[PDB]
Amino acid sequence: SQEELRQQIAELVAQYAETAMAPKPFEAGKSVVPPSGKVIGTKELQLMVEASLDGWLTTGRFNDAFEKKLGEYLGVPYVLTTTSGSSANLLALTALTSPKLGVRALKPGDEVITVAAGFPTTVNPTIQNGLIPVFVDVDIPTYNVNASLIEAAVSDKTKAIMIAHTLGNLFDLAEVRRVADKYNLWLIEDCCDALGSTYDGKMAGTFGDIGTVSFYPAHHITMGEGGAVFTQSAELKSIIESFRDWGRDCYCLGSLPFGYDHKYTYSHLGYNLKITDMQAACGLAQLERIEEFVEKRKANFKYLKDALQSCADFIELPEATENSDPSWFGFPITLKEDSGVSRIDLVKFLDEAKVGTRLLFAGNLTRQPYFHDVKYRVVGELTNTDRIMNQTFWIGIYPGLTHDHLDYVVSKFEEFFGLNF
Amino acid sequence: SQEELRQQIAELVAQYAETAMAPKPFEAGKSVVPPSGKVIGTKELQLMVEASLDGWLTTGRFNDAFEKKLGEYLGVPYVLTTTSGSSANLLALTALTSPKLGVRALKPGDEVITVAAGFPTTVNPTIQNGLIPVFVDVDIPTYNVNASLIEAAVSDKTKAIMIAHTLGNLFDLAEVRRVADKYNLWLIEDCCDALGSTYDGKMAGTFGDIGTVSFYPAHHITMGEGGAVFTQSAELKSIIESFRDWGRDCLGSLPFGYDHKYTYSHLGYNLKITDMQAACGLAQLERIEEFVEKRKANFKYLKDALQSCADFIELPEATENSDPSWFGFPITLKEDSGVSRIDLVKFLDEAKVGTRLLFAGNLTRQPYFHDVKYRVVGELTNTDRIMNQTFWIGIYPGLTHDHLDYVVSKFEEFFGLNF
Numbered sequence: 061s062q063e064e065l066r067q068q069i070a071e072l073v074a075q076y077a078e079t080a081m082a083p084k085p086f087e088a089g090k091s092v093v094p095p096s097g098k099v100i101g102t103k104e105l106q107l108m109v110e111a112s113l114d115g116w117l118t119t120g121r122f123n124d125a126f127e128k129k130l131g132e133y134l135g136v137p138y139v140l141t142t143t144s145g146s147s148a149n150l151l152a153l154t155a156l157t158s159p160k161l162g163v164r165a166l167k168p169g170d171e172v173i174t175v176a177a178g179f180p181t182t183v184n185p186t187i188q189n190g191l192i193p194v195f196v197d198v199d200i201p202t203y204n205v206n207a208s209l210i211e212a213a214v215s216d217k218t219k220a221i222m223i224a225h226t227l228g229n230l231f232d233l234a235e236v237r238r239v240a241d242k243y244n245l246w247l248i249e250d251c252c253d254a255l256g257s258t259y260d261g262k263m264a265g266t267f268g269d270i271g272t273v274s275f276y277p278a279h280h281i282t283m284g285e286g287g288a289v290f291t292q293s294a295e296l297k298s299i300i301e302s303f304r305d306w307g308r309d310c311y312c313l314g315s316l317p318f319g320y321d322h323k324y325t326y327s328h329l330g331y332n333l334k335i336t337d338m339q340a341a342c343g344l345a346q347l348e349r350i351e352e353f354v355e356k357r358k359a360n361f362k363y364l365k366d367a368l369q370s371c372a373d374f375i376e377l378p379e380a381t382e383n384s385d386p387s388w389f390g391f392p393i394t395l396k397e398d399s400g401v402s403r404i405d406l407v408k409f410l411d412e413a414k415v416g417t418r419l420l421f422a423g424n425l426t427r428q429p430y431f432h433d434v435k436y437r438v439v440g441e442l443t444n445t446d447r448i449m450n451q452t453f454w455i456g457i458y459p460g461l462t463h464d465h466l467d468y469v470v471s472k473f474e475e476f477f478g479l480n481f
Numbered sequence: 482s483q484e485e486l487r488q489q490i491a492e493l494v495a496q497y498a499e500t501a502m503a504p505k506p507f508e509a510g511k512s513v514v515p516p517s518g519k520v521i522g523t524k525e526l527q528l529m530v531e532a533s534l535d536g537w538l539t540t541g542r543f544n545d546a547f548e549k550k551l552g553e554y555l556g557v558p559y560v561l562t563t564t565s566g567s568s569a570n571l572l573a574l575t576a577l578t579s580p581k582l583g584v585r586a587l588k589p590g591d592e593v594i595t596v597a598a599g600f601p602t603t604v605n606p607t608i609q610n611g612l613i614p615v616f617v618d619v620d621i622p623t624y625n626v627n628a629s630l631i632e633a634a635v636s637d638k639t640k641a642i643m644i645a646h647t648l649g650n651l652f653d654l655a656e657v658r659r660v661a662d663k664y665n666l667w668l669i670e671d672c673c674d675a676l677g678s679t680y681d682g683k684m685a686g687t688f689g690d691i692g693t694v695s696f697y698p699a700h701h702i703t704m705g706e707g708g709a710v711f712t713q714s715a716e717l718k719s720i721i722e723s724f725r726d727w728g729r730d731c732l733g734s735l736p737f738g739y740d741h742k743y744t745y746s747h748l749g750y751n752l753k754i755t756d757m758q759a760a761c762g763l764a765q766l767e768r769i770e771e772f773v774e775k776r777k778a779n780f781k782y783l784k785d786a787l788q789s790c791a792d793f794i795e796l797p798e799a800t801e802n803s804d805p806s807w808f809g810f811p812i813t814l815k816e817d818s819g820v821s822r823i824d825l826v827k828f829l830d831e832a833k834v835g836t837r838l839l840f841a842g843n844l845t846r847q848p849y850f851h852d853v854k855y856r857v858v859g860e861l862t863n864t865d866r867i868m869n870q871t872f873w874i875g876i877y878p879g880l881t882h883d884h885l886d887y888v889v890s891k892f893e894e895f896f897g898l899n900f
């Protein structure tokens with residue numbers, strides 16, 4: 061019997077995942093403390109096998125379940141899965157170029173306000189659609205836009221604001237919101253690293269017109285490769301979907317003959333950025349643990365910050381943005397310049413001690429080699445942005461790290477700083 | 482033991498597949514004859530479970546195997562998997578905008594010669610990179626570019642030729658190459674529908690600088706969603722890869738000893754797949770030779786039998802000196818037949834016979850082309866004819882001679898040839 065063969069395959073899988081996905085006890089000196097990672101188990105492997113058995117391959121049963129459950133978690137009616145966080149950002153900004161949006165459709169030459177201290181694909185979509193990025197400085201130790209600088213970047217060409225809640229910490233949604241409204245600007249919330257974060261009690265990604273998230277292994281939940289675009293607007297949802305699906309027409313011009321297959325009628329300049337149900341299944345399992353993961357990240361963050369307070373004379377510790385409850389992606393630290401050493405020294409020392417580190421992504425996008433010939437504007441100076449590029453880095457606090465993992469990390473900072481003496 | 486649980490699961494799925502993925506017998510009037518489809522079995526489901534079990538998720542073990550085996554099948558050293566045929570086309574054209582190609586790099590305002598009778602994503606990447614598409618007419622009944630018209634579309638802004646081997650039939654490679662070489666133009670072969678096709682005995686996709694293929698279900702092999710970009714140039718491979726991977730390197734004013742993993746040499750996307758997708762495709766690769774021969778067989782059989790309707794419809798013809806791996810069976814309804822394409826398509830639909838039009842028909846007439854900037858050299862006569870009178874039906878591995886026999890009888894019935 062079929063339904064029988066499945067339940068019995070689920071068993072052999074649920075028992076394989078017991079050996080395979082079993083966490084190993086921490087062993088100082090030998091065990092590593094990566095900066096991020098995935099935490100999967102029996103459920104993940106079970107659903108993926110189910111999806112495999114289905115033999116459907118393209119999105120369906122599991123993808124429907126996933127989009128629905130994530131929509132309920134975020135509290136939004138429209139969720140569309142795509143190939144990655146980057147693809148999500150690309151689809152978000154590109155959808156706003158749709159001629160169906162009339163006078164407020166983004167056009168080549170228009171401007172989009174953002175920050176230079178972020179991830180490349182948060183800004184690439186703007187440049188890839190012919191628009192112009194306008195940068196303003198960020199704040200330390202929140203590592204998010206200094207919202208007070210946004211207003212001065214606005215001009216006649218300003219058209220939207222696309223920014224990411226860096227490392228799960230939220231950006232001043234009150235000031236960004238205020239500016240967007242006053243000038244009727246579109247707001248795209250890049251929540252690729254902030255799934256679960258909240259501001260003023262409201263879930264991140266539900267303040268703007270469109271929100272994006274990533275499911276790469278680093279992140280709160282994974283599908284291996286995957287991401288999602290979400291919104292509260294039916295119109296935008298239909299536009300996004302069209303751009304993701306070959307640009308073919310939907311919801312419900314040119315000179316095609318009457319009775320031309322609708323399946324082959326294209327209303328947008330489109331890609332094909334869909335995923336498989338195998339990917340969707342993994343993410344569905346992961347969704348069951350999200351609340352658990354968000355809680356643990358907040359726990360590890362506090363524990364690590366309290367314990368690392370002993371080095372406060374040499375490093376600046378991270379601070380959540382006022383009136384927010386971030387779902388931390390990582391733990392951002394800035395080495396003080398008058399400490400006597402370079403970030404290279406600390407990073408390398410930690411590396412030898414098995415403690416993983418990551419710099420704050422691009423550091424300063426404008427200084428990245430690929431920005432050599434890009435057309436952009438910067439309002440004010442990127443002082444803090446350059447400091448981040450030179451002095452900042454982050455370490456792990458993800459669900460896979462226990463108190464023993466963190467205790468080891470704290471002792472290494474102490475050792476490196478001679479505070480154990 | 483873990484090695485046991487695996488082999489034990491392999492068996493349980495091996496018998497699950499024999500029941501689920503079992504081809505049911507054809508039944509005139511009940512069974513459908515779709516235009517395309519996938520043929521998967523035990524191997525596919527087995528590897529996908531293996532990959533699921535690995536728990537690696539991102540590309541790895543199976544993807545390495547897939548890119549390797551496919552590179553061996555095509556006869557190229559570099560194969561890079563991506564999310565879809567469309568993403569592959571996007572990466573192929575975009576990669577040629579890399580400043581590392583120097584004076585050879587594609588710039589906004591430059592032109593790319595192609596045809597309007599095709600799939601949107603074959604041309605969109607040109608428009609998305611700021612370039613200008615230049616169209617020329619196609620030929621009937623090969624449904625591929627009328628190569629003789631290409632030379633006249635060449636101007637001082639021309640930099641590349643990107644066209645697909647429509648429905649598996651090959652385009653005049655001898656002429657395209659001649660023109661490409663004479664003007665030092667880049668050549669991108671869109672083989673999304675031509676995996677296995679050959680021209681002058683050489684595998685399609687190995688004549689140009691970059692080749693692309695799709696793994697969507699309707700296609701020669703599938704991963705559910707997936708595609709690949711391939712080439713013989715190590716330089717391009719590195720560029721393609723960078724654009725696919727956040728645009729990271731491997732200039733600017735970054736501090737010394739800045740993490741190379743966070744140094745970005747291109748304006749990038751993230752168009753990678755999972756090893757679950759790669760596994761499925763790896764299984765599929767074990768059947769490609771079988772699928773290519775069956776499609777060629779179904780094609781011959783269908784064309785021969787359908788010869789009885791030659792007074793009303795124009796039958797497909799392989800391009801001279803080629804051996805196409807047919808994706809579908811393209812047919813053009815003659816205008817003086819007294820009926821319209823809608824009539825035949827609807828009749829066929831009612832009889833459970835699937836049909837598809839030739840994709841965009843004429844891209845320049847598609848609504849999204851309303852304000853696009855492009856040039857057309859000559860007239861798109863045949864292109865417009867295709868948009869109005871052409872359509873295709875299935876000949877994929879899932880179709881048996883009984884499936885085809887039924888299709889032929891319905892065409893005859895339609896035209897009153899059975900009387």
Ligand SMILES: [Fe+3]
Pocket residue numbers: 322323
């Ligand atoms: Fe439709």
